Amino acid sequence: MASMERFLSVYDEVQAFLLDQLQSKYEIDPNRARYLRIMMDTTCLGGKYFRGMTVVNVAEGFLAVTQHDEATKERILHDACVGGWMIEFLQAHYLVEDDIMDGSVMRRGKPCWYRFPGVTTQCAINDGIILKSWTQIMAWHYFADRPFLKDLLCLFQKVDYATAVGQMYDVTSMCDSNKLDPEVAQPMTTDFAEFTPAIYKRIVKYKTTFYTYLLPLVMGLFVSEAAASVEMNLVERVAHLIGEYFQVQDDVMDCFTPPEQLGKVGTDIEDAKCSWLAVTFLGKANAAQVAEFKANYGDKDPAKVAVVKRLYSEANLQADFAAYEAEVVREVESLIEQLKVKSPTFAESVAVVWEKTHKRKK
Amino acid sequence: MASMERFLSVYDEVQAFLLDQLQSKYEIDPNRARYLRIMMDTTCLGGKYFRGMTVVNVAEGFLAVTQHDEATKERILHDACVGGWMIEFLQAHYLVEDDIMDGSVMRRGKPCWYRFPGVTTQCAINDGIILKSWTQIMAWHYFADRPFLKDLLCLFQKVDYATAVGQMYDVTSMCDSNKLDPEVAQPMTTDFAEFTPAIYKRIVKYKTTFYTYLLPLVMGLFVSEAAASVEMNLVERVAHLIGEYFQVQDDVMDCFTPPEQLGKVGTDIEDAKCSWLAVTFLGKANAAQVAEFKANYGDKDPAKVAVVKRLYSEANLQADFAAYEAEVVREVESLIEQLKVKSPTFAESVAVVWEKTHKRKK
Numbered sequence: 242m243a244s245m246e247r248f249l250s251v252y253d254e255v256q257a258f259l260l261d262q263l264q265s266k267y268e269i270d271p272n273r274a275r276y277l278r279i280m281m282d283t284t285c286l287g288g289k290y291f292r293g294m295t296v297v298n299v300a301e302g303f304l305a306v307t308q309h310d311e312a313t314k315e316r317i318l319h320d321a322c323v324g325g326w327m328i329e330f331l332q333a334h335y336l337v338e339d340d341i342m343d344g345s346v347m348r349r350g351k352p353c354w355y356r357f358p359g360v361t362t363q364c365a366i367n368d369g370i371i372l373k374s375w376t377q378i379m380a381w382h383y384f385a386d387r388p389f390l391k392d393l394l395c396l397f398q399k400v401d402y403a404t405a406v407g408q409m410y411d412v413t414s415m416c417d418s419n420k421l422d423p424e425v426a427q428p429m430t431t432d433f434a435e436f437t438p439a440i441y442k443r444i445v446k447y448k449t450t451f452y453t454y455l456l457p458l459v460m461g462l463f464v465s466e467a468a469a470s471v472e473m474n475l476v477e478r479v480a481h482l483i484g485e486y487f488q489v490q491d492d493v494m495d496c497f498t499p500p501e502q503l504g505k506v507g508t509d510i511e512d513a514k515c516s517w518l519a520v521t522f523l524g525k526a527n528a529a530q531v532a533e534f535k536a537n538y539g540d541k542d543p544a545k546v547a548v549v550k551r552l553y554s555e556a557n558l559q560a561d562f563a564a565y566e567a568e569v570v571r572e573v574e575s576l577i578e579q580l581k582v583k584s585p586t587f588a589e590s591v592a593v594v595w596e597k598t599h600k601r602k603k
Numbered sequence: 604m605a606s607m608e609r610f611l612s613v614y615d616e617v618q619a620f621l622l623d624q625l626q627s628k629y630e631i632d633p634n635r636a637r638y639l640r641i642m643m644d645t646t647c648l649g650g651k652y653f654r655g656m657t658v659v660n661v662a663e664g665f666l667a668v669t670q671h672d673e674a675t676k677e678r679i680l681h682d683a684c685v686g687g688w689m690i691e692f693l694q695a696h697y698l699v700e701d702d703i704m705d706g707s708v709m710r711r712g713k714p715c716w717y718r719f720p721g722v723t724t725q726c727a728i729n730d731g732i733i734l735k736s737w738t739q740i741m742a743w744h745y746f747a748d749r750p751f752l753k754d755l756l757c758l759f760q761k762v763d764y765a766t767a768v769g770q771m772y773d774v775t776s777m778c779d780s781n782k783l784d785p786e787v788a789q790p791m792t793t794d795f796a797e798f799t800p801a802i803y804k805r806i807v808k809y810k811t812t813f814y815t816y817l818l819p820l821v822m823g824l825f826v827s828e829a830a831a832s833v834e835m836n837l838v839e840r841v842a843h844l845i846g847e848y849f850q851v852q853d854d855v856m857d858c859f860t861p862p863e864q865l866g867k868v869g870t871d872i873e874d875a876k877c878s879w880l881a882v883t884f885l886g887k888a889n890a891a892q893v894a895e896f897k898a899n900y901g902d903k904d905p906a907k908v909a910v911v912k913r914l915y916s917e918a919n920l921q922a923d924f925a926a927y928e929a930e931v932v933r934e935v936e937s938l939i940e941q942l943k944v945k946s947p948t949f950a951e952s953v954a955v956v957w958e959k960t961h962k963r964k965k
C-alpha cells in the first residue's frame with residue numbers, strides 16, 4: 242500500500258534523527274547504535290500500523306474539507322506521521338514489557354524481543370524504557386514549536402498512565418481481590434468470581450482502548466487543530482467501544498487462531514488470564530463444565546490446556562461472539578451516526594477505523 | 604530533621620491525590636489501591652531524600668535573597684517539594700527496574716520490591732512503569748498552570764532519556780563492543796579492555812549524573828524562575844563532577860560497606876560490572892594480579908568473589924580513592940568559586956549538596 246510506505250518513510254526520518262543524536266550528543270559507539278537500530282526495527286516494525294495510520298487517516302480527513310496551502314498540507318501530514326509513530330513507539334514499549342510479563346514466545350512472526358539471544362530480560366526491560374523515552378524525544382523535537390504541544394503531551398501521558406493501570410488490572414486478574422497483598426504470595430482464584438463481564442470490561446477499558454483508539458483518534462484531531470469541531474464525549478465512547486471489540490478479537494485469536502496466521506503464540510489459558518473466552522464460558526457453562534474448567538485453567542500443562550480448549554469448543558463460544566459482534570455493530574453505527582451531526586468527515590474516519598477493525602484476521 | 608518532615612508531608616498530599624484519583628477516575632478497588640499505596644511507600648520512601656531535598660534547598664536559597672509575599676514563599680516551597688517528589692518518583696522507577704536488571708536482593712534494608720512475595724518480576728516491571736507515570740501525573744496536576752512547565756517537562760524527559768541510555772551502557776559494560784549483537788548470545792569480555800577511566804566516566808555520566816544532580820539543581824532553579832541568573836555551563840559541569848563522585852562512592856560501598864550499614868547487598872563483582880574498583884584495579888595491578896582477576900570476576904561463586912575482594916584489598920585501592928577524592932574537592936571548590944560570580948546563593952546551595960555528598964556513609 243502506497244500510504245504505508247509514506248508513513249514508513251517518516252520512520253526512517255525519525256530513526257535517523259534519533260540515531261544521529263545518540264552518536265552526536267550521547268557518545269554512543271556504532272555497535273550500541275546498531276543494537277538500538279535493530280531493537281527499534283524489531284519492536285517498532287512489522288505490525289499492522291493501524292494505530293499510527295489511524296492518526297494519518299483522521300488528518301487526511303480534515304484536509305479534504307478544509308482550505309490550506311500546499312505546505313501546510315505537507316506539514317500537517319508530516320505531523321500526523323510523527324504523531325502516529327509516537328503511538329507506535331508507545332505500543333512497542335508496552336509490547337516489549339508485556340511479552341516479558343506474559344511469558345510470550347513470538348510476536349510478528351519473530352521471537353519476542355527479550356527472547357533474542359543477544360538481548361535477554363535484563364536488557365529488554367531497559368530497551369522498553371528507551372522506547373518510551375524515544376516518544377518524548379520525537380514530540381519535543383518535531384513539535385516543540387506547535388500550538389497543540391501541551392494538549393498532545395497531556396493526553397499522551399494520561400493515555401500512558403491509563404494503560405499502565407490497565408496492565409496492573411490484567412496481570413492481577415486471576416487473583417482474588419481480597420487476597421491481593423504485596424507481603425503474601427498471590428494464589429490463583431478458585432472461585433473465578435471476578436471473571437465477570439463488568440470486570441472484564443474495566444480491565445480492557447484501561448489496558449487497551451485508550452492507546453489503541455482514543456489516543457490515535459484524538460491525536461489526529463490535535464494535529465489537525467480540529468478538536469473543537471467534534472463531540473468529545475462521542476469520540477471517547479466510540480473509542481472505548483471499538484477498543485473493547487478489538488481486545489475481544491484478540492482474546493478469541495489467542496486460543497483459536499493458528500500461530501502462523503497470528504504471528505504470536507497464545508498464552509492466556511496458561512497465564513490464567515481473565516479473557517473474553519473465559520468470562521463468556523463461565524457465563525453459559527453448566528456445573529460440570531465450570532468444575533472441569535476450574536481444574537484445568539492456569540497451568541502450562543499442554544494437556545490441561547487441551548481440556549480448556551475442548552471446553553471452549555463444547556460451549557459453542559462462536560455463537561456468543563456473533564451476538565457480541567452484532568451488538569457492537571449496532572452501537573458503533575449508532576455512535577458514528579451521532580458523530581455525523583457536528584462532524585461528517587470525522588465520523589467517516591471512525592467508519593474506516595471500524596471497518597479495518599471489524600475485518601481483521603491477525 | 605524538621606525540613607524532611609515538611610517534604611514528607613507533601614508526599615502524603617501527593618499520595619492522597621494520586622490514590623483518590625485512582626478510586627474516582629480509574630475505578631480501582633480498595634485492595635489494588637492498597638497494593639499501590641504499599642508499592643509507593645516501599646519504592647518511594649526510606650531513602651536519604653537527597654534528590655528531592657536538593658530542589659528544596661536550591662529554592663530556599665533564592666527565597667532568602669529575594670522579596671516575596673508570604674503566599675509566594677509558600678507556593679514556591681510547595682512547588683519545590685512536588686518537583687522534588689517527581690525526581691524521587693523518577694528514581695523509585697529506575698531502582699525498581701535496576702534491582703531486577705542487576706539481580707539485587709535488598710534496598711533500604713528491605714527486600715527489593717520484586718522480591719516481595721506478593722509482587723514478583725511480572726508485577727514489578729509494571730509497578731515500575733506506574734512510578735514513572737505518577738511523575739507526569741503530578742507535574743500536570745500541580746504545575747499545568749506554571750510558566751516553567753514546558754521547561755520543566757522538557758528537561759525531565761531529557762534527563763530520563765540520558766538515564767535510560769546510561770542504563771543501557773551499564774548493563775552492556777561487560778560485553779566487548781564489537782561482539783554486541785541482538786542475534787548472538789553475549790559473552791563476557793576476557794580482555795577487560797573497555798574497563799577504562801574514559802569509558803567508566805561515560806557510563807556514569809548518563810546513568811547517574813543527570814537525574815542525581817543536574818535535574819534537582821536545575822529544577823530548583825526552574826521553580827524559582829532563577830535559571831537566567833546562573834552560568835548554565837557551570838551548573839552542568841558541577842553536576843557531572845559531583846555525580847561522578849557520588850557513583851564512585853556507590854561502587855566502593857558495593858564491595859566494602861557491610862550490608863547492614865548500606866541497606867543493600869553488593870552485586871557488582873558477580874554482575875561483572877565496569878565499576879570504579881575494577882577500573883582502578885586494572886589501572887594499577889601487575890600481570891599476575893590482572894590474570895587472577897580475569898579468572899574470578901563476573902561469577903556468583905562466593906569463593907571467586909572472595910578472591911576479587913582480596914585482590915582489591917591487596918591493590919590498596921583506598922589510596923587511589925583518596926587521590927581521586929582530593930582531585931574532586933579541588934575541582935568542585937573551583938566550580939563553586941566560579942558559580943559565585945553571577946550567583947553566590949546558588950553556589951552556596953551547590954556547596955551544601957557537595958558537603959552532604961562528601962560526608963555520606965550509605
Ligand SMILES: O=P(O)(O)C(O)(Cc1cnc2ccccn12)P(=O)(O)O
Pocket residue numbers: 335336339340343345404408411448449491495
Ligand atoms: O500480548 P497480546 O498482544 O496478546 C495482548 O493484546 C497485548 C496487550 C493488550 N493491551 C496491552 C496494553 C499494554 C501492553 C500490552 N497489551 P494482551 O492484553 O492479551 O497481553
Ligand SMILES: O=P(O)(O)C(O)(Cc1cnc2ccccn12)P(=O)(O)O
Pocket residue numbers: 697698701702705707766770773810811853857
Ligand atoms: O543498584 P545501585 O544503587 O547500586 C546503583 O547506583 C544503582 C543506579 C545508579 N544509577 C542508576 C540509574 C538508573 C537506575 C539505577 N541506578 P548501580 O548503578 O550500581 O546499579
Ligand SMILES: C=C(C)CCOP(=O)(O)OP(=O)(O)O
Pocket residue numbers: 287288289290332349449453487488491603
Ligand atoms: C490487543 C492489543 C491492543 C495488543 C495487540 O496489538 P496489535 O495486534 O495491534 O499488535 P501489532 O498489530 O502492532 O502487531
Ligand SMILES: C=C(C)CCOP(=O)(O)OP(=O)(O)O
Pocket residue numbers: 649650651652694711811815849850853965
Ligand atoms: C548511585 C546511585 C545514583 C543509586 C543509589 O541511589 P541512592 O543511594 O541515592 O538511593 P537512596 O538514597 O534513594 O536509597
Ligand SMILES: [Mg+2]
Pocket residue numbers: 339340343345
Ligand atoms: Mg500479552
Ligand SMILES: [Mg+2]
Pocket residue numbers: 339343411
Ligand atoms: Mg498482557
Ligand SMILES: [Mg+2]
Pocket residue numbers: 491492495
Ligand atoms: Mg492477547
Ligand SMILES: [Mg+2]
Pocket residue numbers: 701702705707
Ligand atoms: Mg543496581
Ligand SMILES: [Mg+2]
Pocket residue numbers: 701705773
Ligand atoms: Mg545497575
Ligand SMILES: [Mg+2]
Pocket residue numbers: 853854857
Ligand atoms: Mg551500585
